[PDB]
Symmetry: D2
Subunit: 484 residues, 4 copies
């Protein structure tokens, strides 16, 4: 029986959810596609159902969004910012139950569910101010009576495909900035976080509707691969922002390129921690633990490879091993819990596969490697030593808590090994020259680099230069005017 | 027999050119691939020969470039700017003979050959100033004692593929900006402008060498589709800048995307729109020079002219009278305006296009024929009477054919122009301010360049990183 | 008897006001200086009393503010932005009663009282986003191993002196930006709007105190000229932002310069409207009316000089005259009212003086010129013709609704006349070349220029380039680091 | 008899200098004020003479400048940039003789005289690039159909008052930026560097004239305190840039404030701080060259050196050994490091300062005496043993006297340095990262320039305006 029909989960109704929900929103609510049940990963119990988009729903929604755009694009950017502000406030009002839904359906612990909603609120607060800054310079020409104008216009319809592990804030970032830039949006979320997508969309729909704006400015089309593929191939989707697996992302990028569209791709993270001989172990150990096992190893920023100098390799592993033992496991909505379940049963199987492959490729499981004996999708946070940095499994996209540990003897080889990889790098050392080399041209090619950083989400590290990220959701033109 | 073996073309030797030239430079000169002979399009005579890159030449050049990068990337951006400045100086010193080579091998008129080199000179001066602006903000972290640094680093090796019609300045732009950004470069130009590529590379090579820098910072691998494809597929080429045809460009972009690399693509069917209230003394000369400049072979060349029906006949008549005064001649002839098409195939394509235009109901009101003289000369051509969506008027083909269209409403002309995909520029003539705002604004043209009555580029060649660093109420120690 | 002791004005207590209020806040509330009564300008009735700062209060407050700065400056700018956000929300919660207080004590109509509070809220919303953007570039040196860093630091203590006519939002703009920039503030408001200053400070004090921050980050020292002079002369006040009369402002600027301090001065506005022969009279007439008589002619942006082409001079005057007749007069808190009283009795006397001086200098009063026969400080909105553009009275700082009208025959002379003046210019014409000349180097030297603008406060027109206004509240250093 | 009438100084004529020169330029050359003779500080011989501006000369020059501005302000910023570029070229062509004049009249060594002209050349190149960046954003209005344009306009006439110690480059900076920003300029330099002011103005005047521009765009009125005061009080001078002494600067700023004009003031007592963990191989040469460069007459000259007590004696001893090797000579002597003070009064002030330092308990550990040779030569000087707040060590006086102070704690040395008002720069030597962040951050130095172990400027010359313009659901018409 459905969790939403059970008394203690009645709070789900505060988000407008019921036993069976419409997964399409374009000003009207609907859904003639496949009905999907989403499950609570902490106990494998069905929560509720969502009627996903058919192809016809998708087609209709795109047309309605492009119609809404005609209205929305004529609304001054600061007034668009005000709408985004109101979205932030509406999320604020529901931050506790929406956070609880994130922990329930997705599986991250409560303060991260709530904190992810907070990131969306923060982004809205930011966007209101940003909306006053959207524009380019007028420069004088070398020609008398001629003006040179850098003009920024909305791209039109921004398609947004998001992943299971951040099922609120990635949409939120894309949506807040796309909106202030004068675009309409169409969202296809992970099918296993459909209730979350529906709930967020209900909050946004109310703001739009209260402001007498067409709902399709923020359209939703819940669905699986066919819907995502349709968006990738749709010339009416002027910009496709995709976040998710490397394999699907590659195919999305190719489809967009084939039609000369624009895409923004945020793909898989095989992130490294490097601890040099002179590292502060009091910093290294807790930072590595939270980076590796936080959100059950399912962040795009999750530490999956730990390089340790051979001199301190054993001590650091021994302390991580003891630390892993003390991780508090349970339901993710229990405030005491630090470690919840993996998102799906398939995830647990992928985890088991990876662990076997690591062993066969020479690795030793010095902690974990196994499924926990309890309801839900619980696996032991896992540590593997002995592999070469070259090992195929260590460079396999697996959203599971498996930490591959590598020894190194000097700066030379460990820099080289990491340069062989093509999201974030974190180093621990007191050698300033070493830090400058790693931050400079010869170092990591990662978009995110941390230096001696001890262990809310750090959205500030994922923001073009400075505040110019809005330019990614607009198109530039150079306009030359002869007013002579 | 080769022009470069004739006394009157001895000036070619001032560029270090010989009867047969090495088309590979990576610190050393070489080339073990196929020889290519390039021809002057003004008389179809062979100029000289270039030995192109083999696959092995390519592989070795990439390796040497990546080795040079270890040295180049360590040089502070302003110092790299000074190298680029010296390149501009070296170009300036050879501007007359290099310009003449551009005119001789490619076919554009001398003032434009020289002008294109001058454009590269100006780019170098621009790049020097830019080189002191490369950097990012330190932002405050929300966490006390932590700094957020926005760091910019070179991407590494920048591959540059260029086209025949601007065989100097497009490379120049990519090379100067990529250089100040701390990248090494690898150039593959159009096979039919190989001598120009060699000559430019010789000038740059001398500057590098005189500064005791490794020459592979500005590497050359002359070749055709094989070399270009290798670059597109090569994981060692961190960024591929391609300029050229949409067909080839798409395949390049796809290949780059297949390996998660970065590409810059510059691939346009430019339109001019004259509304009823237009100043025709602006419209007619603008249309003419945009249509026939460089014999219709620019990426910005005007190929479609929309005219309000009330003024359509007059503007066409005025254009015809002005076209008749176009001064045709060899690229080096004083005061000439109009030279040859780049190739014999261009001439065939031109004739094809004219035939198709008549077949689809169009009228040739001016030109349309090959000129009976040596070289690849065709009459600059005007076609009326075609429908706006007629397949021949959207065909990407570098020929001086201007297709003219009537319109009644602002609404319909905007509609017609907004169903062209990936147009490069749109130029409008009108005195209606409201109309201008409509055309420039969100519901208007989608073109990247818009004309009315006529500094962040370095980030394209670098990679950004966000770097976070750690910098009873009483602090003891 | 005091209005605050009368039943219908009990809403004043929602702002924490009582019969006698402390006018000093520095973490503690106090005031050993002169007690002042402020009056309702609509009826001359006393509202309540405020105990202003003594010199000793002032000295103590400055020391406490500089102590608070040691704490405040160590708080990350984005966290400072969050405090400013909360101030915005706290103002929001009290926007109706605070707006009503502005209409009561200051005298502008209710939607402007409320709207002025809204401007402060808007500025706070803006500042939260701005706080993430505070910083300068790191550039590479020509010298290997050397970094060039543009560093921004708070100036320290920012003294803020404001005027009667915008007794909330000018402080608010200065305070919001100064705060995110890591400064502490000290406020001295107009003595005749002391209750407003006290109320705003109570709202801010609560936010600071709830966040366990020292209250002196946002200090208040109510007082008259001696307090303002002390601030001007105080080397501990690193930046003095002054808004008010030209005469006092000049003296403030000189005192600051004498001690090599920094000042920001916003002084008197003798603003012009120019209507050319080809102007849209349907735009000109209502725009001139609201610009001239809005807030009873007491804005820094108030239109005081109207240049009309001789061809349309008479029609435009005749229509303004008819329009003035239909202005709805009454208590400014009455939602129906468009036109309230002048702020003080002295203002009414200044008004009478100006009108007499205009007559003696050759001018004709074609409408108004007189005091209205009713309780409070009501004068007739006034129109004067016949003066030369040269007339001394027409270039006299008088916050009164007097509109001096001038004829001109051509663009030449009217541009010249205006260039003789050294805040805002508004032109009405269809001649594009004319517009470009007036906007360009040869035109107005005003900081604000409007073109055919028809008639909430336009804070966007009072914002250095773009969003760089925060630099005015910080000090720049160029730091050269040798990390080689 | 005048140096310029001697054969060996005939090179002065290459600058258009004569026995007596006009010190007013406003399109025409003139000067009806007092004649001044300037002297070479290396031998106290008269060089040549300049006829300065009378009040009437000043009044007429302002009028002519404001008339020139009507023309100049209409020229597009990039075109104004090109004029500035040509000025840089013209300076470069005379760089050797103009540099020698700087050395001859002002007294800094030749490599620095030439170097200062080179600085002006470099500024001109910088300004050319800046000239294409002058502009503001169009921002969206909150009101539909309305645009917010940020407009920048020239302020009009920029007055420039400069000092003796950098008699070329300070004017150069102000002039080049003010010019590209569309302003006209009026220059009054130090009376004792009048010949330098004339020579620079002759170079600029020729560029303007050859471009058919009115010469008053770059006007000159040579004079003293009377002319400077007139500029400060003159409502027609929209912006007054003053560089010089704090005493005079304050009065200038006050006079400008009295008339609601704009001023830029550049008025410093620079400190060096060596902590216990400092690299002394960095400290000693840095301290020496910063202390004695230009015989101690830069605005950046090191006058206070704080040394941790543990290393104080060693650093002092090392400085003394290095000071003894300073190569003293005439400014034109090859390989020399140290020339004369600018004036005889500077020498008197130096002797005064040395006496006062001993009187207040200081010890002269090196130098302290006049050198017994022609000209205004004094020994570069080191004084130890004084208290940090001793009145003589904070006196603004351009002399090569380095005051040395001991300290024990970071806390006390920071305290001592933070009770100096309006210090220009602070240079620290230390390997402690935490200490650096403390010194660079909000609780650290208040100096505008901070050194560790060693593009928005155009808006200063313009005025900003915010310009708002107007650009059943169905729209009819
Ligand atoms: C990785 O899991 C990841 C990447 C980016 C974000 N954002 C920025 C778009 C939302 C805060 C979240 C998570
Ligand atoms: C079109 O033919 C075209 C495009 C771009 C350029 N550049 C910029 C890369 C060189 C001036 C030239 C020609
Ligand atoms: C004039 O009365 C005036 C000037 C400025 C402001 N501001 C900006 C500081 C507050 C909105 C208000 C009124
Ligand atoms: C100090 O003597 C000093 C200050 C400033 C300058 N400039 C910039 C105006 C010229 C390089 C020189 C010397």
């Amino acid at each position: 029986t459905l969790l939403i029909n059970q008394p203690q989960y009645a709070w789900l109704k505060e988000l407008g959810l019921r036993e069976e929900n419409e997964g399409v929103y374009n000003g009207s609510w609907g859904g003639r596609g496949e009905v999907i049940t989403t499950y609570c990963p902490a106990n494998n119990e069905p929560i509720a159902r969502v009627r996903q988009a058919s192809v016809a729903d998708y087609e209709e929604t795109v047309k309605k969004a492009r119609e809404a755009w005609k209205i929305w694009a004529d609304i001054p950017a600061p007034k668009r910012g005000e709408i985004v502000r109101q979205i932030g406030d509406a999320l604020r009002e529901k931050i506790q139950v929406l956070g609880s839904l994130v922990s329930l359906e997705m599986g991250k612990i409560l303060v991260e569910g709530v904190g992810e909603v907070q990131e969306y609120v923060d982004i809205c607060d930011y966007a209101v101010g940003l909306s006053r800054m959207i524009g380019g310079p007028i420069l004088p020409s070398e020609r008398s009576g001629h003006a040179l104008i850098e003009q920024w216009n909305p791209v039109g319809l921004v398609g947004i495909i998001t992943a299971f592990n951040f099922p609120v804030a990635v949409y939120g970032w894309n949506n807040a900035i796309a909106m202030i830039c004068g675009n309409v949006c169409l969202w296809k979320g992970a099918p296993t976080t459909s209730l979350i997508s529906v709930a967020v969309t209900k909050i946004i729909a109310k703001v739009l509707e209260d402001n007498k704006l067409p709902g399709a400015i923020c359209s939703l089309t819940c669905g699986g691969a066919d819907i995502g593929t349709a968006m990738a191939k749709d010339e009416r989707v002027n910009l496709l922002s995709f976040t998710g697996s490397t394999q699907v992302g590659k195919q999305v990028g190719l489809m967009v390129q084939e039609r000369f569209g624009r895409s923004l791709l945020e793909l898989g993270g095989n992130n490294a921690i490097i601890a040099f001989e002179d590292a502060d172990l009091s910093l290294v150990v807790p930072s590595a633990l939270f980076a590796a096992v936080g959100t059950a190893g399912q962040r795009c920023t999750t530490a999956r490879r730990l390089f340790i100098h051979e001199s301190i390799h054993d001590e650091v592993v021994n302390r991580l091993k003891k630390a892993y033992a003390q991780i508090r496991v349970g339901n993710p909505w229990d405030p005491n819990v630090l470690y919840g379940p993996l998102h799906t049963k398939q995830a647990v199987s992928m985890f088991l596969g990876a662990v076997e492959e690591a062993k066969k490729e020479g690795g030793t499981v010095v902690y974990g490697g196994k499924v926990m004996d309890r309801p839900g999708n619980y696996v032991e946070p896992t540590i593997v030593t002995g592999l070469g940095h070259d090992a195929s499994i260590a460079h396999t996209e697996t959203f599971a808590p498996i930490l591959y540990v590598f020894k190194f003897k000097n700066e030379e080889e460990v820099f080289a090994w990491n340069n062989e990889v093509k999201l974030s790098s974190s180093i621990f050392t007191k050698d300033l020259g070493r830090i400058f080399r790693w931050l400079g041209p010869k170092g990591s090619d990662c978009g995110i680099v941390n230096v001696n950083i001890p262990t809310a989400f750090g959205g500030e590290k994922h923001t073009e230069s400075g505040s110019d990220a809005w330019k990614q959701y607009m198109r530039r033109s150079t306009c030359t005017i002869n007013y002579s």
